[PDB]
Amino acid sequence: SIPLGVIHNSALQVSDVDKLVCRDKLSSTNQLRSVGLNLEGNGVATDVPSATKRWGFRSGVPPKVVNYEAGEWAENCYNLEIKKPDGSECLPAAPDGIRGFPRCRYVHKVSGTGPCAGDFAFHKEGAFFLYDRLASTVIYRGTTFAEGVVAFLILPSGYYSTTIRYQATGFGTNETEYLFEVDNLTYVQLESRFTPQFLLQLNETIYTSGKRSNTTGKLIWKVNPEWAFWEXXXXXXX
Amino acid sequence: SIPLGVIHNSALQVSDVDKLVCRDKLSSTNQLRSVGLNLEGNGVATDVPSATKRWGFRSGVPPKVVNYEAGEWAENCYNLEIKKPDGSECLPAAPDGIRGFPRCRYVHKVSGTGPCAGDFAFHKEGAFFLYDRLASTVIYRGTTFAEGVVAFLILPSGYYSTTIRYQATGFGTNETEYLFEVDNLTYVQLESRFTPQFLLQLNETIYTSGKRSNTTGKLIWKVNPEWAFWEXXXXXXX
Amino acid sequence: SIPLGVIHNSALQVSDVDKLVCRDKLSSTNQLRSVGLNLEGNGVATDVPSATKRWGFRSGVPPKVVNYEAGEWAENCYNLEIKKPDGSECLPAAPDGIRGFPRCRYVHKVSGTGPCAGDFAFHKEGAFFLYDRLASTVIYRGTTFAEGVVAFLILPSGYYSTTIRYQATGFGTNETEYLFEVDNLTYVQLESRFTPQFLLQLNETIYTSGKRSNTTGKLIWKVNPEWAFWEXXXXXXX
Amino acid sequence: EAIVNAQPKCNPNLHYWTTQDEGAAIGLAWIPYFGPAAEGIYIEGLMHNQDGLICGLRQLANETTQALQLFLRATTELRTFSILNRKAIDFLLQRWGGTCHILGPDCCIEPADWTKN
Amino acid sequence: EAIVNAQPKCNPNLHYWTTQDEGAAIGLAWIPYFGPAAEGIYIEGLMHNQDGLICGLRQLANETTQALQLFLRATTELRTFSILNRKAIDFLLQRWGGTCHILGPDCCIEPADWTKN
Amino acid sequence: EAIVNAQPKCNPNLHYWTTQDEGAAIGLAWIPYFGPAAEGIYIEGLMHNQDGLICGLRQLANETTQALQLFLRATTELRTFSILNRKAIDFLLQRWGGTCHILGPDCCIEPADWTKN
Ligand SMILES: *[C@@H]1O[C@H](CO)[C@@H](O[C@@H]2O[C@H](CO)[C@@H](O[C@@H]3O[C@H](CO[C@H]4O[C@H](CO)[C@@H](O)[C@H](O)[C@@H]4O)[C@@H](O)[C@H](O[C@H]4O[C@H](CO)[C@@H](O)[C@H](O)[C@@H]4O)[C@@H]3O)[C@H](O)[C@H]2NC(C)=O)[C@H](O)[C@H]1NC(C)=O
Ligand SMILES: *[C@@H]1O[C@H](CO)[C@@H](O[C@@H]2O[C@H](CO)[C@@H](O[C@@H]3O[C@H](CO[C@H]4O[C@H](CO)[C@@H](O)[C@H](O)[C@@H]4O)[C@@H](O)[C@H](O[C@H]4O[C@H](CO)[C@@H](O)[C@H](O)[C@@H]4O)[C@@H]3O)[C@H](O)[C@H]2NC(C)=O)[C@H](O)[C@H]1NC(C)=O
Ligand SMILES: *[C@@H]1O[C@H](CO)[C@@H](O[C@@H]2O[C@H](CO)[C@@H](O[C@@H]3O[C@H](CO[C@H]4O[C@H](CO)[C@@H](O)[C@H](O)[C@@H]4O)[C@@H](O)[C@H](O[C@H]4O[C@H](CO)[C@@H](O)[C@H](O)[C@@H]4O)[C@@H]3O)[C@H](O)[C@H]2NC(C)=O)[C@H](O)[C@H]1NC(C)=O
Ligand SMILES: C[C@]12C[C@@H]3C[C@](C(=O)N[C@H]4CC[C@H](N)CC4)(C1)C[C@@](c1ccccc1)(C3)C2
Ligand SMILES: C[C@]12C[C@@H]3C[C@](C(=O)N[C@H]4CC[C@H](N)CC4)(C1)C[C@@](c1ccccc1)(C3)C2
Ligand SMILES: C[C@]12C[C@@H]3C[C@](C(=O)N[C@H]4CC[C@H](N)CC4)(C1)C[C@@](c1ccccc1)(C3)C2
Ligand SMILES: *[C@@H]1O[C@H](CO)[C@@H](O)[C@H](O)[C@H]1NC(C)=O
Ligand SMILES: *[C@@H]1O[C@H](CO)[C@@H](O)[C@H](O)[C@H]1NC(C)=O
Ligand SMILES: *[C@@H]1O[C@H](CO)[C@@H](O)[C@H](O)[C@H]1NC(C)=O
Ligand SMILES: *[C@@H]1O[C@H](CO)[C@@H](O)[C@H](O)[C@H]1NC(C)=O
Ligand SMILES: *[C@@H]1O[C@H](CO)[C@@H](O)[C@H](O)[C@H]1NC(C)=O
Ligand SMILES: *[C@@H]1O[C@H](CO)[C@@H](O)[C@H](O)[C@H]1NC(C)=O
Ligand SMILES: *[C@@H]1O[C@H](CO)[C@@H](O)[C@H](O)[C@H]1NC(C)=O
Ligand SMILES: *[C@@H]1O[C@H](CO)[C@@H](O)[C@H](O)[C@H]1NC(C)=O
Ligand SMILES: *[C@@H]1O[C@H](CO)[C@@H](O)[C@H](O)[C@H]1NC(C)=O
Ligand SMILES: *[C@@H]1O[C@H](CO)[C@@H](O)[C@H](O)[C@H]1NC(C)=O
Ligand SMILES: *[C@@H]1O[C@H](CO)[C@@H](O)[C@H](O)[C@H]1NC(C)=O
Ligand SMILES: *[C@@H]1O[C@H](CO)[C@@H](O)[C@H](O)[C@H]1NC(C)=O
């Protein structure tokens, strides 16, 4: 049976089936709750290059959706607009009723291209893509999601969100290139080491140091080197 | 909890939750019934101008649908074909499986234009638009509905329908004009006071008095003045 | 109530409702099973001409779908691509999530034309078209199905599939003509008497006897005359 | 609570439509291919205001709306068919969701004829 | 009632397909990205006519059709997945839907070893 | 079994979002036409690791995934909303799915105050 969590002896635990516990009380369906937890909270790498490597395309497996009633405020969410080199869409449009994950501090909107050798994009570790009270096994186009897993159990500052935009080539491969976007003509080579706050700070200095492209071509910066979150012209910058 | 009706002491009443009544018997799911009642039966104004003022457009609220198993024969139903002035549709097509309300004595089919400042049309008093055993919070294009509300409870002449067609400008506003249609070129200025039977009688006299437009332009009549139901040429007529 | 099967006294039987049997035990929802059985197993004629006569077009009846959890390996399945003479499709595309029946020894793919005097194709005997764990009252275009019925009850060599292609004119009528296809230009007049294995054997001899059309026109063979399964040039062949 | 009809008017009679509970069809009317169209699957009945049930029904559906709307806001299901089954489950959980203490007020076991034993 | 197979023939053997009940997958076969395609999620079994269950099963599915079709006509759900859960609820309501009168015929409480006390 | 958090890290605090259970809206906020948009139907709360429930919750959702994925593979429902109702039904069937032998270990009837009678 799908595990069901219950609090015995001041500790959560999975209820053993073949053992019946008459002392446990279920007074109404309200006592049952479905719950989604973010992979964030387990310490996974949340930077775009590390996160995208956990997703992959596959055919022959029909997508599946399951609902959950409560979720967790996420530090990092993702929003993908991936096409093939010929411009055809890699991800399906969001089905009716599936909205973005409701609480994200940083939405990493990645746009770009990749081979997309599969009808759908799944989570390689079997996790779920968490949407608004709906968990899907696949990724929907242009829809904000957090990586997460679902639990079932028996009960006994405002919201600020900022979008960080990226450009990708070779998406979903071993040789993926990423560019942080500060405007439509000025980009920064992306490293796994760059945190969300570092990207927002670097963006502002580029705007205040006038280091934006003042031509009509794309300007690409590289940068010198310069614990979990809750605890064609190239150049350089040091 | 959503209220649930039960018959205690020869009187219906909402079952109190925290009070358990062991004498109440629920022998099967068949004893539970969902039920839809028409706002008609509460004495609301059913004429087109009064009824339409209870509906309004709004965005950001996803539509919701709930089913009901039994309904009430309606005196008045409505069927809307509203476009913006530029000809784009204001109401969504009926989703698959949603048919018109099954029992209507008069279907008021309103066609016309309005600003439609919202993705969907809701009931301003929070009632439901009753379709065929499906209750929706929004209005679907060209689909016949009655205004109504749903109840849940525990159990212990043919059908004639006639269509009355209207034309509307400024639909969903404070300054809406309505025209009763007797043919494609002959109309009557609509008043809240006009009952369905009065409209059908006035239509027949216009046909039998030859007062229809015998030109190629639109003929618009105004008319002189001349309890619930269960108990460009203008002119005049007195 | 929908009948529910139970094993009393070493024999299956429908559980009488008004008689309560306290000795019957239902320990979990896992004990309840929905099950689909093929009309094949009751001895019906499975040849294309006999099978198609059990299906017919009808309007005004909305399609309905019910799921089943376990099914039976079928000897015969069918896959229809029927258009009107003007080329419009007669059958609807398969709704999302409805795949072909999962186990078929012979898929009879019939392509052709008929009047199709109805919005959907139903089973004239009220049986179901069995798909992959979904039973529908109607036929979907290009989707493999077996004819079957569903049962509900309380519990107390590889897979080889070959496609046999046909051509049909006057589909869904009293005067339907069928042609077994051995290639795109060589056909055999179809008789009810022809079994699947006979069709595969006749196909191979035509290929090994060089009796295929070696022109650019269609070659049609007729053939001389020459228990259930589990127990424009014409010509002749004898 | 109690239901007090607070509506401007009340149609005391109820001409209703619904669908039949099984019922052996005359011959082959159960086959969808032969059966009635969507427009002809309904039965009809008329119920008067004995015990005031009709006017109470209208008030009950009116007062249900707020809870129903708040339920529909919180669900992500586009069409909800499960309210009545969930109320049936709640009915059973209220009475049988924990140990049944006989002679207790939240346990519906009557050993009356087991007491005369 | 009783089920009497009244069909022209009966395949007494039942080669069946279905899906497995959980079952720890060998390593990562449970991950949808790595797991089998839609065509390879099935198991197979063969069941013979011991106690005549196979031929009774075929007659039972045949006789179920009328009620099932009439149920599908009356519902507005495009796809029905709730028949078995609703039968489970009906099972519990038949036995526990009212007060349980011990020693009564509609109450499944046996105080046999509570009587020897 | 027992739940042992075997994850590389654990956020011991849980900032959560959900929807409210009914709650009388201030005036007309329950009407969909007047109510909040999809983005503003949520409440928020913060829960710390008392009794280690947060870190156990993260491990529980991690360990649920295999069974959940295998369930989703075997169902043909595109969106599953029935897991919790079915667990409620299973809860009742485990205790009340057969005759209740008093003083037995699989029957949750306590005649303690019926024994003092
Ligand atoms: C529930 O919680 C557990 C524990 O937190 C999660 O377990 C993770 O499971 C995934 C796979 O399901 C693991 O990912 C695998 O990691 C292996 C080792 O990781 C590194 O460490 C070794 C050193 O020991 C290095 O040599 C190695 O290179 C790695 O750097 C990899 O060997 C695996 O490789 C696979 O992926 C790569 C990249 O795609 C492919 O090239 C390979 O061919 C191969 O397919 C794989 O990456 C992960 O390490 C586990 N975490 C922990 C902490 O143990 C569960 O995933 C989680 N469940 C859910 C649903 O969230
Ligand atoms: C369940 O049953 C109850 C009782 O039958 C219904 O209650 C109705 O609720 C609606 C609102 O939800 C009420 O509509 C409001 O009426 C107010 C007063 O109505 C007239 O009376 C005063 C004199 O006292 C006049 O001055 C006034 O102008 C009205 O002529 C209005 O003030 C309200 O105005 C709102 O709408 C207008 C027009 O859209 C706007 O211009 C305003 O800005 C404002 O937004 C409003 O119209 C109605 O009166 C109530 N009826 C009764 C009998 O009390 C529930 O609606 C019902 N529930 C469901 C789900 O059906
Ligand atoms: C559950 O199991 C039972 C029993 O196996 C099935 O019963 C079958 O029901 C169908 C109809 O629902 C029967 O089909 C009908 O057969 C009649 C007689 O068949 C032949 O026999 C007589 C000789 O007695 C011949 O004269 C006759 O011409 C037939 O050759 C026909 O008279 C019926 O005709 C209808 O169809 C034709 C062709 O479409 C039309 O032209 C007619 O106008 C008329 O509409 C009809 O064909 C079938 O015979 C029954 N079988 C048995 C063994 O009795 C159930 O169908 C099954 N339920 C499900 C859901 O599977
Ligand atoms: C066990 C739970 C504790 C806490 C409230 C939970 C809950 O839903 N509580 C209801 C009653 C109390 C209050 N009014 C809110 C609503 C039940 C949801 C929780 C959760 C939410 C999100 C992710 C992970 C976990 C957080 C888990
Ligand atoms: C309490 C009810 C009385 C009456 C029959 C109701 C019902 O469904 N009765 C079934 C059993 C008896 C008969 N065979 C029909 C089917 C139950 C439906 C009712 C209703 C229908 C429509 C709107 C409002 C109310 C009318 C409410
Ligand atoms: C009564 C049944 C016997 C047998 C296994 C059935 C079943 O589902 N058994 C489960 C437990 C045992 C095993 N592990 C498989 C899964 C239960 C399904 C059956 C069937 C399948 C298909 C068509 C017609 C009938 C075949 C009917
Ligand atoms: C993926 O890229 C790495 C280095 O970029 C390379 O070593 C490896 O061979 C590549 N994989 C394939 C399948 O070519
Ligand atoms: C940047 O580009 C996007 C798409 O190419 C466009 O929608 C947007 O308006 C552009 N912004 C500016 C400031 O040019
Ligand atoms: C980068 O800095 C500019 C300067 O104010 C700001 O307008 C822009 O929004 C910043 N970009 C992001 C992604 O925050
Ligand atoms: C123009 O671009 C250069 C380098 O790209 C930058 O240093 C400078 O601040 C920009 N603005 C000017 C020169 O006004
Ligand atoms: C609506 O129309 C009325 C009269 O037709 C007018 O008094 C009122 O100002 C209008 N409302 C708005 C918002 O203009
Ligand atoms: C009236 O107009 C409608 C639409 O403009 C058209 O469909 C209908 O045939 C017309 N009827 C007559 C009698 O002209
Ligand atoms: C108006 O009267 C004519 C005359 O018979 C009739 O044909 C027409 O249907 C009537 N219109 C309506 C809406 O009933
Ligand atoms: C023509 O129209 C006039 C007024 O519009 C009307 O009085 C008359 O009856 C109509 N028919 C005729 C003149 O035949
Ligand atoms: C169907 O065809 C048969 C023979 O092919 C013929 O006797 C019968 O009249 C036809 N049916 C109709 C309705 O024409
Ligand atoms: C036969 O015809 C079909 C459709 O006309 C086509 O797809 C297929 O390639 C053809 N095969 C050959 C061998 O010509
Ligand atoms: C007919 O025989 C040829 C000869 O091998 C074979 O390739 C073809 O697949 C056969 N047709 C069918 C339907 O099996
Ligand atoms: C050509 O066709 C004839 C008859 O259609 C057949 O007998 C012969 O084997 C075919 N092949 C040849 C002549 O190579």
Curated annotation (Swiss-Prot), chains A, B, C:
It is a peripheral membrane protein. Changing residue 203 to D: No effect on GP1 and GP2 expression. 12% loss of virus capability to enter into host cell. O-glycosylated in the mucin-like region. It is found in: Virion membrane; Host cell membrane. Changing residue 91 to A: About 60% loss of ability to counteract host BST2. Residues 23-156 are annotated as: Receptor-binding. Changing residue 139 to A: 90% loss of virus capability to enter into host cell. Glycans are attached at residues 9, 174, 184, 203, 214. The record marks 26, 32-33, 57, 64, 139 as: Involved in receptor recognition and/or post-binding events. Interacts with host entry receptor NPC1. This is GP1. It comes from Zaire ebolavirus (strain Mayinga-76) (ZEBOV).
